[PDB]
Amino acid sequence: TLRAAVFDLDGVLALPAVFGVLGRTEEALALPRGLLNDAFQKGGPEGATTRLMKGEITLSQWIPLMEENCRKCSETAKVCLPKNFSIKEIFDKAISARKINRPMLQAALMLRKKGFTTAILTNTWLDDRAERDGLAQLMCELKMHFDFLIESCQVGMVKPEPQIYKFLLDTLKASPSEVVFLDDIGANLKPARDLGMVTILVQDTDTALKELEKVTGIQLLNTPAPLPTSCNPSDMSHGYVTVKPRVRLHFVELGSGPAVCLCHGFPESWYSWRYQIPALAQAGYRVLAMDMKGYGESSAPPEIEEYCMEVLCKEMVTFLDKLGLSQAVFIGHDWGGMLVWYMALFYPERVRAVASLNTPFIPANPNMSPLESIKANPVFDYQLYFQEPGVAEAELEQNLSRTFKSLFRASDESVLSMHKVCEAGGLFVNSPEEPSLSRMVTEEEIQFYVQQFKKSGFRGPLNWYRNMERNWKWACKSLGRKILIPALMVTAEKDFVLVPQMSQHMEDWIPHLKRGHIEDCGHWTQMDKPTEVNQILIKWLDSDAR
Amino acid sequence: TLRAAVFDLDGVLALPAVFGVLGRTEEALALPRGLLNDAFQKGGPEGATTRLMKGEITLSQWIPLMEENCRKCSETAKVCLPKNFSIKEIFDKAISARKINRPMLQAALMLRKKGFTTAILTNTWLDDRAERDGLAQLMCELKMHFDFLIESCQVGMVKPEPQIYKFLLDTLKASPSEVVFLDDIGANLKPARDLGMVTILVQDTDTALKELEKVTGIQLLNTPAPLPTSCNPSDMSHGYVTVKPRVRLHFVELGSGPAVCLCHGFPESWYSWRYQIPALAQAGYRVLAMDMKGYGESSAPPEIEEYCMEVLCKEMVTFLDKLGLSQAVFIGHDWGGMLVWYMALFYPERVRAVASLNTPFIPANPNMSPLESIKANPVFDYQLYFQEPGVAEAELEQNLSRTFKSLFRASDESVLSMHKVCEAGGLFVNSPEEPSLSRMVTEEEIQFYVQQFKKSGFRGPLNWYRNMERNWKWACKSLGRKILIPALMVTAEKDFVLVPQMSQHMEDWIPHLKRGHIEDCGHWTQMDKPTEVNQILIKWLDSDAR
Ligand SMILES: Cc1ccc(SCC(=O)c2ccc3c(c2)CC(=O)N3)cc1
Numbered sequence A, B: 001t002l003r004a005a006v007f008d009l010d011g012v013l014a015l016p017a018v019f020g021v022l023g024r025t026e027e028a029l030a031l032p033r034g035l036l037n038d039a040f041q042k043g044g045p046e047g048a049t050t051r052l053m054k055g056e057i058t059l060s061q062w063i064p065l066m067e068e069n070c071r072k073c074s075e076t077a078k079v080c081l082p083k084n085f086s087i088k089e090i091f092d093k094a095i096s097a098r099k100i101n102r103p104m105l106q107a108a109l110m111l112r113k114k115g116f117t118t119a120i121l122t123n124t125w126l127d128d129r130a131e132r133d134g135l136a137q138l139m140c141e142l143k144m145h146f147d148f149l150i151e152s153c154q155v156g157m158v159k160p161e162p163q164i165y166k167f168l169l170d171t172l173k174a175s176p177s178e179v180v181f182l183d184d185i186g187a188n189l190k191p192a193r194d195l196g197m198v199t200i201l202v203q204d205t206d207t208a209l210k211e212l213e214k215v216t217g218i219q220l221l222n223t224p225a226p227l228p229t230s231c232n233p234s235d236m237s238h239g240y241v242t243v244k245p246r247v248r249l250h251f252v253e254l255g256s257g258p259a260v261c262l263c264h265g266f267p268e269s270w271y272s273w274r275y276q277i278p279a280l281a282q283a284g285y286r287v288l289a290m291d292m293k294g295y296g297e298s299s300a301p302p303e304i305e306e307y308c309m310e311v312l313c314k315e316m317v318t319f320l321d322k323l324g325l326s327q328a329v330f331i332g333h334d335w336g337g338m339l340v341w342y343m344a345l346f347y348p349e350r351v352r353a354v355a356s357l358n359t360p361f362i363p364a365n366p367n368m369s370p371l372e373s374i375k376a377n378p379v380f381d382y383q384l385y386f387q388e389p390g391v392a393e394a395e396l397e398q399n400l401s402r403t404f405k406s407l408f409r410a411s412d413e414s415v416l417s418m419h420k421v422c423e424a425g426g427l428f429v430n431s432p433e434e435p436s437l438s439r440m441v442t443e444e445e446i447q448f449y450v451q452q453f454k455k456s457g458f459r460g461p462l463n464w465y466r467n468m469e470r471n472w473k474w475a476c477k478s479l480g481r482k483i484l485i486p487a488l489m490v491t492a493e494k495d496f497v498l499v500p501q502m503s504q505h506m507e508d509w510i511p512h513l514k515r516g517h518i519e520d521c522g523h524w525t526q527m528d529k530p531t532e533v534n535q536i537l538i539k540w541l542d543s544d545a546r
């Protein structure tokens, strides 16, 4: 039985095939048929192209050798080449236009999800062109999705030589009969078939995928829209900044470009942005996903005042100071959203742009104390139960797995009675001891949050709700200001605490505010609707955050 | 006696003073004298400007209020303002042209070096302009050099109100008689003098500095060229990437912009780039200063083969893969330099540009084994003593302080006999047990390297020299290639192992190679000549690495 799938890059995982450019070029330039492909294949396994693919020479060294083969191929067929003609120009465009074959990637991902060992096997070159980054970016993206990437120029062997195939079996630690091999070049397909491997000639993706699904017995074609790429914690770059003697801040970092700082809510983690981190990095941003003060690998001092908004924001400014960042885009959810609006108001110089998921910006009422204000809405009663130190800590820390499984659920999966929690005398009253697994989460993900909360518990997290009065007084200083820097408000239709209607007057304080709205989305926005969140964020970042 | 110095920003630490723009504008536009300054100061402590400086309103909200005051100031004096006239345009240019007053910064740094508590006290605003980053960048740079930064808009108090002064004493935890206060506005100077503080009216920097040196008793004017800013390890952002199950890589990170990856030599540390990290970040780069495999907080597996060049380079590619970086500029010294040339040769796609300090690129001789090659030069005899496992480890680990103090010395400070170490039967033969402190290093810096080498010792570091044969075979695959990506070779005049002449033929393999040369510079290039290294690197990065 099959347990490994192998794919070529050109014509299989990446389209349009770079080899096809020779054919299009001669047709566009009305040149003799196959003239470009003959110059490209001159000398066979002794010629320029084989040397390049084995890694003997770099692409920049090969460019003039291919041109010499082009003048030799033209003089025989009695033809003239134009003066505007450049081989580098032709290849630059072909490499630049070659994009990932998404349905083929999805199929490769689905096979790996189902236990298959996957690999890319390609005839490639050492790219030293001034424009090499384009391909480095494509390869970097593609490679993370496979167990192995075998490149001809790195192994010094080429397809169709039999050595590379034996090297491929050796890497996969599998018998040829356990391997499906996909290629667009019949010649390169032959030696794999010869060893007894299952082969697929790839012409059109759809047919190749039909051949793949019948041979693996797994549905790969027409399957549902897959979730965005997530994060495996152990494969991330983990960063640590000391902001003051007793306070260190932890973050996960991915990508290059403008710094985007992601701020989670209560009782969350950097992992809460797992579906946004690869997506935002791929979109051209440097993502810094925080473990906010009180959470995960970040310090959790006991004192209530360590979690007032003023202190939290000053510490976030020091975080940028110590990392040498003059600015960052700040994107927050729930308590992170509140932090992010106050970063925009108090430190507009350090905030490139501001975005909030679910959390609206509501100016403090200087006439009404926040305890009065919170009491006026029955949906905010849980926050009053959070006030007394040690009480909610006790309940939420008793069974970590039950806590997260009960919390992290979609709009139609509610198990916790969010009303009259003070009257009921408990947050977990009339709730299962063993809740069902929400469709949003896996057992492993819940267990990641469980392990994270084992270090400091709920004291620091709950303290974020225990500075209602300090936060109110601090907020009153900002009453005459407006948020005039780029801003995005994203509302979640089915969040019954942070309701979309609560954001209705924000235009009065943020006139140029931009918006997004997600239908059928609960409180846990990022994992409830990851695809839409990424769509809205990337669209807004590219237009407003540069 | 004086123990604290306080400086204003505008007109003191930053020039040309932004307040002076009002005067230049009216003179250039041939407008009534003081017209701009009257509109700027309209309503006094009740008007627009005071509100802005206290933080009641942001700069963008103030812009139209100042314009309203400009139409009111012009109608009284019977004058017309042009149609091309914009207040925002005037302030944008004034903020943009305002640069750091380097001699004033040097003086502030020298006072802090001598035990003074230093602070910036300024009347500033909440900057929310599209161009706010310019000032955020200036403030971020300036602030790191002081114990405190008190901003009017953040504290909600302004100069000359007496409250801010009492707030300043409170922050400094010092009596007014212990404080020197520097300001360009006599009015803002008055309340400090009134409390008994030492004051300095700042008109021209030179005179202000003369007044400062006589009052502190420390030479601040005409003093020698200071060393570049260094790194305090505890204030850095520390990053950790797992490249394989048993291998994690540690790095220090600072700045934004293109990623510059710094690779140290033997037996060094990320700290070896201490003088380059702030300088390169300030120059517009994202610096990643590595703890190379075998060093510091990075993993140090015991096996010799874990340190062959192929493995080291593959791990550096995975480092970029896990951080989500398609490329980095690679800058290396000694063994890091060798790694960096092999990164350019084997992975040109992932290398934006390559730079080496001291280490030349020499192609492998396919006819001569590296043991023969190394033997041909008597300066390389220490490398033969490094070959036998456990021998050099024993000597170098016996006294860590003696090891580093003996090694880290300038060209005229040599204490170790580098010749016939095998014949002498020891690396430390006829060398002091307690060497003098080199002028390049402080006791604290040596002790940082001592603490770093306490975790894994010298086995992993020495293993870099123990793959002569594997490295040679691997290098032979690259014999037909050329380095065609941007490249810099920096030679050190007095390095007697890695001599400048050894780099003489590099143009044959790197035709577009760029060069730098540092005279009177030993092996430890970065700490021997930090200023010149930074000059050469920044100049090359800005022209060749974008
Ligand atoms: C028992 C309990 C109740 C509330 C919280 S706060 C975080 C939370 O669970 C939550 C917040 C807002 C919200 C929902 C859950 C569901 C919803 O629609 N809005 C924590 C523990």
Ligand SMILES: Cc1ccc(SCC(=O)c2ccc3c(c2)CC(=O)N3)cc1
Binding pocket: B266, B267, B382, B407, B416, B418, B427, B428, B494, B495, B496, B497, B498, B522, B523
């Ligand atoms: C005892 C000993 C000898 C050599 C080394 S290698 C690093 C080193 O110390 C060094 C390398 C090159 C070099 C100098 C020192 C001085 C110089 O001019 N070139 C380590 C320990």
